[PDB]
Amino acid sequence: EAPNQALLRILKETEFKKIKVLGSGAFGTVYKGLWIPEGEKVKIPVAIKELTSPKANKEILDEAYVMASVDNPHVCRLLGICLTSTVQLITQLMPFGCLLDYVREHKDNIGSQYLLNWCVQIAKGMNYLEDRRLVHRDLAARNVLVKTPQHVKITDFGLAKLLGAEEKEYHAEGGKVPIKWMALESILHRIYTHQSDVWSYGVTVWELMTFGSKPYDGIPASEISSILEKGERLPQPPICTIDVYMIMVKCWMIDADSRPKFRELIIEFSKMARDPQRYLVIQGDERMHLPEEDMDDVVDADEYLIP
């Protein structure tokens, strides 16, 4: 294995000035503020995340480890961490929030072009993680953030595991994974591969095409395992042609090797992105268009590279 020569940058608490809370849950809270490097005359919109026990600090550093070892336009990169007491994770701010809540609140303005483009960008990000031998194990619309309506990034590496040079699959033992996005072999045998992420990709695409619906809605998670064995899958969304829907089905095959690779998914959706109204039928597809005081020195984190 190649030596991971990534750089973990330790940030001072006096550098950034937090504002408000983006969200709060049982997992933790997410803040927002402006990271201002020491005398560099730049202000960077960032998102501060915290999950106060030794158990909490260990798991949050594992995520920080992975997040600081990725460098792709469609993957959230860790900017640095702040040693406070509870460790904070500082990352680039994604103003439009997660993609799931985005499509639910803009379904009457989202065209086929945006939908197919998102599917390409997600597949590009996932393919990158496959190159880094990283298995996400938690791919969903909620785990996809929106920088701009035409640029999304993958995230949440709280379950991401790295495979060795001679390792093909990962074995779990915890019990905190969303069943409705998991592959069949993952539910039954705790086996996680890159092709198990393909299943999650298929469900993720289904979420987007249904404009943010709940997969297997009205069905308990303890019954999902038995249902998949019967051969039952998610239905075909109204806007989807058989071309798009068949791709999802391929991601839901029993044989993991029969499932498409991410690099193949990139090509397929890219072809459809050239003529989006041929593969996605949406009513009024044409007439749809998605959109402080002292902020002249504000620079996006993507334009601020490592000094």
Phi, psi of 198 (to 5 degrees): -65, -40
Binding-site residues from annotation: 22-30, 49, 91-92, 156
Q: What is the largest CA-CA distance in the chain?
A: 63
Technique employed here was X-ray
Q: Domain 94-290 falls in which CATH fold?
A: Transferase(Phosphotransferase); domain 1 (1.10.510)
How far is residue 151's CA from residue 71's CA, in Å, rounded to a whole number?
16
What would the two tokens of residue 292 be?
Answer: 């402080």
d(Cα 176, Cα 19) in Å, to the nearest integer? Answer: 31
Read off φ and ψ for residue 63, nearest 5 degrees. -65, -40
Terminal Cα distance for the chain, rounded: 27
Are the beta carbons of 266 and 127 closer than 8 angstroms? yes
Catalytically annotated residue among 71, 131, 138, 297:
138
Please, where are the H alpha helices in 182-223?
184-189, 194-209
Q: Phi and psi dihedrals of 224, rounded to 5?
A: -60, -40
Q: Which residue from 209, 262, 261 is spatially nearest to 237, judged by alpha carbons?
A: 209
Residues 299, 79 contacting (CB under 8 angstroms): no
Cα–Cα distance, 194 to 133 (Å, whole number)? 8
Q: Which CATH number fits domain 1-93: 1.10.10.10, 3.30.200.20, 3.30.70.2390, 3.40.50.300?
A: 3.30.200.20
Indicate if 138 belongs to the active site: yes
Phi, psi of 247 (to 5 degrees): -65, -40
> 7 with 25: CB under 8 angstroms?
no
Altogether, the residues listed in the chain come to a count of: 307
Six-digit token string for 242? 């058989």
Cβ contact 125:134 at 8 Å: no
Domain(s) of CATH 3.30.200.20: residues in the chain:
1-93
The binding site for ATP consists of: 22-30, 49, 91-92, 156
Q: Please state, in angstroms and rounded to a whole number, the distance separating the CA atoms of residues 225 and 190.
A: 12
Which two structure tokens, joined as six digits, stand for 50? 């915290």
Q: Return residue ranges of the chain for CATH 1.10.510.10.
A: 94-290
Residue 65 makes CB contacts below 8 A (sequence gap 6+) with 8
Cβ(112)–Cβ(280) below 8 Å: yes
Cα–Cα distance for residue pair 81/61, rounded to 1 Å: 9
From the list 238, 241, 263, 261, the residue with the least C-alpha distance to 251 is 261
CA-based radius of gyration for the chain:
20
